[model samples]
Target: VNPTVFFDIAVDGEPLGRVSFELFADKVPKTAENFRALSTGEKGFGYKGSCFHRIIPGFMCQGGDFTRHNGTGGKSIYGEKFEDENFILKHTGPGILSMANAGPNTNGSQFFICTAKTEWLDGKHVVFGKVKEGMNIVEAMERFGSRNGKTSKKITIADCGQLE
Candidate 1:
């Protein structure tokens, strides 16, 4: 879609600033659609207190399990089986957004943003879009501690409205 998806992550009531995603609808149609559907304010896919649970130092940052918003076992949002990797993009650098799958085809609402280069993931996960702005926010937020209960760095999707 590459349609601008405006959002803000905050704590309590303080605005952590606005960030946007340039969604790639053509590359990962179902993945993009699922995110869009969840982000709708009415649906509340990313509401207050949701988090980016698992963060490997050099690999990827995982999130999207609303029930286990903190990386703990809970519930999962059912997603469609992904087609054979079709895009020609690679998770070669930070700010790159890609789908998070349980295995080869089970792609749900979860996804991650690479903080460093990861070309091995190319053709593996559905490459969506890159962060157009506020990458620093993600970097800064990643530095904060996280885990099951002790997880910090609360990123709330203050809102997710359409571009048009």
Candidate 2:
């Protein structure tokens, strides 16, 4: 059976509830593995204190730049960048989890959650997972307003792991 990952998010140090996702391991093995390892902190430090550095209403919220904390730095558990696994999946609607990258084959730890249908992004990024629960929190984040430079609420991935 495929593994399911659950992430608990918080805003401004307040619990925003949990979001669950099922990895497309069968199709995007490497990308799924990268996220799984990072989420579980198998690489020593995971996305615990990472913040949603970029937020855009009717679009998406980007985060996972744990190293630089400014949407500019992040690496996979491989200690380097990896190739893109963009295939089959498309950004069809809200709560879509995709790998954030500068261009092709530049996928790392950075990722974004689509709050609306972003068909324009189809095939441009790696769609590795999707939010299966607690989408209300995502909506709340969207309504929190766009943040320039850094967010005041500090959306954090408090905990993450396989659902077992």
TM-scores, in order shown?
A: 0.76, 0.93
lDDT of each: 0.63, 0.83
**Deviation (Å) of 14 in candidate 1:** 3.8
lDDT of 2 by residue, 1-164 (tens): 65788878888889988888878888888899888888888779778778778888878989889999888899998766888865789998998999998888888899999988888888889898888788888888777656453455678877888884
In model 2, which regions exceed 4 Å deviation?
Answer: 147-150
- Looking at model 1, the pairs that clash are 1-24, 1-25, 2-23
Report clash pairs, candidate 2. Answer: none
- Model 1 earns a TM-score of 0.76
RMSD (Cα, Å) of model 2 = 1.6
Error of 2 at 159 (Å): 1.7
Tens-digit lDDT string for candidate 1 (86-150):
55667768888887776676665677878788888887787877787788777665665354323
For model 1, where is the 10-residue window of minimal lDDT?
72-81
Candidate 1 residue spans exceeding 4 A from truth? 11-13, 41-49, 72-85, 146-150
